[PDB]
RNA sequence: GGCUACACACGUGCUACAAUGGACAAUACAAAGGGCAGCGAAACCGCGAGGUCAAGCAAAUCCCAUAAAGUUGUUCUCAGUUCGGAUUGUAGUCUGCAACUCGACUACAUGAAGCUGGAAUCGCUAGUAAUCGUAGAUCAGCAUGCUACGGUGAAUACGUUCC
């Protein structure tokens, strides 16, 4: 466990800091460089001090519940006002401008007829 | 407690290192054991936590 | 023992003069928690109750009680007779610190933890959890989970209200 | 406009809430024009926007502000 | 404002389903075309899209412009993965009289179906298919399309039995 979440033993640090919602791969480069360990390494080899440098960055880091937070209240919002947006997210259609005429099956779902 | 069914149920130390929260208690666990978060360091205990009006003023 | 001296050592005090009580015996105690799993698949696999079985037994420490099938059900292909759940009480020394274990260990390892109920009451003095995942606990491995699974956690009192019930769990540490 | 520049507003839009900025706000206020961006200037006011055949009515609210009044008038009718 | 709708059906292309591969550091070899209130070198700032100052340039002179695939190294280890990159949310840039309807691009985070495709069917006989990038026209801005360009580079075609 890092953030409330585990993460593989078998896949490496920067890679393993991926399996985060909200940790991506820029962000697990830029988080062991502040905590610096190496990436090369393998979590069932890294022992105490590393892991705690880790987390100790890791906490100033919205992750695991916060961002989750931040979308739902974000969209809950934008349906709450009648917008074009929360409209779509309302009725699960695309909502950056795509054309829905062939093509939108992501937010859709798939073939209904 | 029947003799032959139950565990080896002993006295471990659950450290806090985070705060260094030292507590004593049984467990099966098979004596120093690891732990990252608790009532002594998690936020809502503890108390600390890390708008479109005021987003559009400063732009 | 901390949490049982802490009660005998500051609760008491604490809480009957809240409540304005005479006599010590008065004072709410803790007498036991029944922790349930409440396994409906075992119709489909027995191996899911043995896991269970295991699951809570090193999570508390004794064999936990299969319950059983009290009154047959169709909608559920389940007959009388048949496992489901398993069930342990716990009392004493055991109690208090697997309840400061849930207040201390587990609880704060929840995947989204953003407080627990605070309406979870019967009425009468009885407290539940409704927990969503069983490798919050240190003793499961999260490795070997063949299943992520929830539970339930009762409390259950000598207090005669839910108010009473509260203060004793805040004067302990829950949330 | 998503850019340095700052946001937009059309002027005669602008005059016409600088006029209802005593605070009485009797009127609704007629438009076109959905190209604007909304400010926290415009809360509690009710504006009537041009959908394309209708000036329809709209609440502002501070939910409202990084936003635009076109947001709240869909062009398109589908059922 | 709409031609950008969407319960669905078809056609034509792009991205992929991974190890003949992904990511990352170094390094190499082209064509052809365009450029005046237009191409914008170098330097500086920014993680990047870009921005400030500004040189040359009406051309075999300066610019777009470091071609990529490659080759050599490290690392991944056959998993819905370090494949995939849709979808969505946030902060942004450039253009524009204004990017919600309805622009492109960027950064961060999330990480969809998809593990080589049923009946059927298509292109291609050589620098061709296959693959890799590049330029232009229209164009304030927008190209997975259109037209042109070159780099690497096959296998097979016995024969007219049959459609
Ligand atoms: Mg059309
Ligand atoms: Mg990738």
Redesign the pocket.
């Known amino acids: 466990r890092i953030a409330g979440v585990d993460i593989?033993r078998?896949?490496?640090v920067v890679?393993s800091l991926?399996?985060?919602?909200?940790?991506?791969?820029?962000?697990?480069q830029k988080i062991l460089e502040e905590a610096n360990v190496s990436a090369?390494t393998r979590v069932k080899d890294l022992t105490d001090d590393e892991l705690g440098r880790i987390r100790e960055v890791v906490d100033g880091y919205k992750v695991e519940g916060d961002?989750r937070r931040?979308?739902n209240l974000?969209?809950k919002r934008?349906m709450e006002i009648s917008s074009?947006?929360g409209i779509?997210?309302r009725?699960?259609?695309?909502?950056?401008?795509?054309?829905?005429?062939?093509n939108?099956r992501?937010?859709?779902?798939?073939?209904?007829? | 407690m029947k003799q032959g069914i139950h565990p080896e149920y002993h006295q471990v130390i659950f450290l806090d290192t985070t705060t260094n929260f030292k507590f004593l208690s049984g467990s099966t666990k098979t004596p120093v054991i690891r732990l990252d978060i608790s009532s002594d360091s998690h936020p809502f205990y503890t108390g600390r936590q890390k708008g479109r009006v005021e987003?559009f003023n400063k732009? | 023992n901390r949490l049982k001296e802490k009660f005998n050592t500051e609760v008491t005090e604490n809480l009957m003069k809240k409540f304005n009580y005479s006599s010590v015996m008065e004072v709410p105690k803790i007498d036991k928690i029944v922790v349930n799993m409440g396994v409906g698949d075992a119709v489909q696999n027995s191996k899911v109750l043995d896991n269970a079985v295991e699951e809570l037994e090193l999570i508390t420490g004794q064999k936990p009680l299969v319950t059983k099938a009290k009154k047959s059900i169709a909608t559920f292909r389940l007959r009388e007779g048949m496992p489901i759940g398993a069930k342990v009480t716990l009392r004493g020394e055991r109690m208090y610190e697997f309840l400061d274990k849930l207040i201390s260990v587990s609880l704060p390892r929840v995947r989204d933890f953003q407080g627990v109920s605070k309406k979870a009451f019967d009425g009468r003095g009885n407290y539940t959890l409704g927990v969503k995942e069983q490798l919050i606990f240190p003793e499961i491995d999260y490795d070997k989970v063949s299943k992520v699974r929830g539970m339930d956690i009762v409390i259950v009192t000598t207090a005669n209200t839910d108010e009473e019930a509260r203060e004793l769990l805040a004067n302990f540490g829950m949330p | 406009?998503?850019?340095?520049?700052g946001?937009?507003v059309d002027e005669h839009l602008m005059k016409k809430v600088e006029a209802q900025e005593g605070s009485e706000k009797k009127q609704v206020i007629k438009t076109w024009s959905?190209?604007?961006?909304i400010f926290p200037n415009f809360i509690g006011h009710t504006f009537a926007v041009?959908?394309?055949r209708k000036h329809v009515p709209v609440y502002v609210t501070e939910d409202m502000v990084?936003?635009?009044?076109?947001?709240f008038?869909?062009?398109?009718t589908?059922k």
């Not at chain 4, 008038?73 to 398109?76: L, S």
């Open positions: 593989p078998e896949k490496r890679i991926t399996y985060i919602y909200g940790i991506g791969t820029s962000t697990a090369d961002l931040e979308t974000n969209i934008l074009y947006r779509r997210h009725r699960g259609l695309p909502v950056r401008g795509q054309k829905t005429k062939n939108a992501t937010r859709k779902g798939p073939v209904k007829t | 987003r732009k | 406009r998503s850019i340095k520049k946001p937009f959905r190209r604007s961006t041009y959908d394309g990084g936003h635009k009044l076109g947001e008038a869909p062009t398109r589908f």
